[PDB]
Motif scaffolding. Structure first.
Motif, mmCIF file in Angstrom:
data_model
loop_
_atom_site.group_PDB
_atom_site.id
_atom_site.type_symbol
_atom_site.label_atom_id
_atom_site.label_comp_id
_atom_site.label_asym_id
_atom_site.label_seq_id
_atom_site.Cartn_x
_atom_site.Cartn_y
_atom_site.Cartn_z
ATOM 1 N N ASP A 115 0.841 -1.197 0.000
ATOM 2 C CA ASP A 115 0.000 0.000 0.000
ATOM 3 C C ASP A 115 0.876 1.247 0.000
ATOM 4 O O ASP A 115 1.716 1.424 0.882
ATOM 5 N N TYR A 120 -3.350 3.973 -3.756
ATOM 6 C CA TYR A 120 -2.361 3.484 -4.718
ATOM 7 C C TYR A 120 -1.632 2.299 -4.094
ATOM 8 O O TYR A 120 -1.253 2.349 -2.926
ATOM 9 N N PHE A 138 0.845 -2.114 -10.919
ATOM 10 C CA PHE A 138 0.468 -0.838 -10.299
ATOM 11 C C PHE A 138 -1.045 -0.643 -10.399
ATOM 12 O O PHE A 138 -1.601 -0.652 -11.498
ATOM 13 N N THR A 139 -1.701 -0.472 -9.251
ATOM 14 C CA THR A 139 -3.156 -0.306 -9.195
ATOM 15 C C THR A 139 -3.578 0.992 -8.484
ATOM 16 O O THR A 139 -2.755 1.691 -7.882
ATOM 17 N N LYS A 140 -4.871 1.299 -8.569
ATOM 18 C CA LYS A 140 -5.437 2.520 -7.997
ATOM 19 C C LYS A 140 -6.895 2.292 -7.603
ATOM 20 O O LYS A 140 -7.757 2.144 -8.467
ATOM 21 N N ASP A 141 -7.154 2.249 -6.295
ATOM 22 C CA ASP A 141 -8.517 2.145 -5.745
ATOM 23 C C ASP A 141 -9.306 0.922 -6.237
ATOM 24 O O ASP A 141 -10.537 0.895 -6.163
ATOM 25 N N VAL A 145 -3.448 -0.212 -13.815
ATOM 26 C CA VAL A 145 -2.872 0.997 -14.417
ATOM 27 C C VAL A 145 -1.677 0.679 -15.332
ATOM 28 O O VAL A 145 -1.622 1.152 -16.471
ATOM 29 N N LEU A 169 4.739 7.544 -11.610
ATOM 30 C CA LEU A 169 5.359 6.594 -10.691
ATOM 31 C C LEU A 169 6.766 6.214 -11.164
ATOM 32 O O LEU A 169 6.994 6.033 -12.355
ATOM 33 N N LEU A 187 5.815 8.752 -6.277
ATOM 34 C CA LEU A 187 4.427 8.706 -6.726
ATOM 35 C C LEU A 187 3.715 10.033 -6.517
ATOM 36 O O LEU A 187 3.869 10.682 -5.474
ATOM 37 N N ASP A 189 -0.296 11.942 -6.888
ATOM 38 C CA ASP A 189 -1.723 11.661 -6.890
ATOM 39 C C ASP A 189 -2.336 12.215 -8.173
ATOM 40 O O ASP A 189 -3.061 13.199 -8.158
#
Lengths: 256, 256
Positions: A115, A120, A138-141, A145, A169, A187, A189
């Motif tokens: 985490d 992210y 790589f992921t988001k919520d 990605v 990133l 990273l 946002d």
């Protein structure tokens, strides 16, 4: 309330990070970007164009510094006392918040997660490409990605504030055991990025001029430094003006 | 966190209110009293006596200014970034908080009260002394303290931090109608006053020197400005010291 240095008299005045503690300053990189100037007083009335906030992009080394790996600098910009990162290092008008700038060592097991903050995350898995390889996702919520197979991995996305080829990133891998060792995580946002436009208003600073790597924002109406009072400049910035006679003028800016 | 100006290199450094926003400053009277100095560095080690906080009494006009009525100045003193009022204007070691410094107009009906804050109140009543007179009673948390018959009334108490003849309250009356009109109220929280002694310790500032109207407090042990760190000075004051090589030293004080 964080005050800056007191201004006296009817001449010009200028504040930067050294003279105004409310502005963004980064001591490790020794970097700041912001100024506030007052010019052209008629008594206690600042004329149109006379109150000017300015900010200019600066570059600072990544926490994980390594020129031989392609980790040199990243851009930073104070924007109303808050750190922002320009998505493009030469353009002030499109910016995002920094989530991580790290050089710590993390370990990801191929079943495991990491985490990164604000939804992210990076997941590791075992893959075969010409033999056993590590696969980072790589992921988001809860959403894919990008991916790489495994030293510097860079994630470049499209339509970030209507821009393309934007690094959101960076990940550097030290080693992989048969679990991966991260040393170098950066990273932004990007999902909550923002754009400054010519038409924007920021309190009484409502004349916005965008000049490449610099933002200048000034007052369109006269701004009166009324004595025995507090007056909003904008975005949490105020002036406090002393209760004197009209024979004097004493005031300081502050942030709330 | 309120920071002061950044110090660079291995030379001496000095902070006052203009250069350190965390110190007490009063803009209407243009008064401050505090300084922090760093002297005699051996590399990043401050020697004994080298870190010095100082504060000196200043005098400021009452909000209700009136030299012809005996309202001239009252003493003030920054003490670790907080305003205090010396109970005796020439002595730094005995101090109390200011509750009111007012020049507003209040009206007290002879049946009525005026809450002054922190359980201090003044009651008015009708009395006969050579005819009809107004009788004001100064109280505290439910307890008599003093009276006058009615322009400046001053309440001078005994055993306030082992001192006598100490003005804790001033009241000026503009007029009396047949209800009183107050214009001039000044009060200190004498019930919670305090004393600074030679034996006191304030964090790493544990060598206290009391010199009449000035307090000087320094470090008895060496104080090391460790790089990439935060170090307590005392009483909410810290230094932040940058993560550089030992070829440099960069740091700033802050208050929390």
């Amino acid at each position: 309330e964080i005050r800056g240095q007191v201004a006296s008299g009817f001449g010009d005045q200028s504040w930067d990070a050294s003279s105004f503690a409310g502005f963004y300053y980064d001591i490790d990189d020794n970097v700041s970007t912001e100024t506030l100037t007052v010019s052209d007083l008629d008594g206690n009335v600042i004329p149109e164009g006379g109150l000017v906030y300015t900010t200019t992009i600066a570059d600072v080394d990544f926490e994980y510094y390594n020129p031989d790996a392609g980790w040199d600098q990243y851009p930073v910009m104070g924007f109303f006392a808050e750190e922002y990162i320009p998505i493009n290092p030469d353009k002030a008008d499109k910016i995002a918040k920094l989530v991580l700038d790290s050089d710590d060592k993390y370990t990801i097991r191929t079943g495991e997660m990491l985490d990164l903050g604000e939804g992210y995350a990076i997941e590791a898995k075992q893959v075969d490409v010409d033999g056993e390889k590590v696969w980072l996702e790589f992921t988001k919520d809860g959403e894919f990605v990008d991916d790489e197979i495994i030293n510097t991995w860079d994630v470049e996305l499209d339509d970030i504030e209507d821009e393309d080829d934007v690094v959101v990133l960076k990940v550097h891998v030290n080693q992989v055991f048969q679990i991966a060792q991260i040393e170098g995580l950066w990273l932004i946002d990007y999902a909550n990025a923002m754009t400054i436009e010519s038409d924007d208003e920021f309190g009484n600073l409502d004349d916005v001029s965008i000049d490449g790597d610099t933002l200048k924002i000034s007052n369109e109406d006269t701004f009166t430094l009324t004595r025995d009072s507090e007056e909003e400049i904008g975005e949490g910035m105020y002036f406090m003006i002393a209760d004197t006679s009209s024979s004097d003028l004493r005031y300081y800016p502050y942030v709330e």
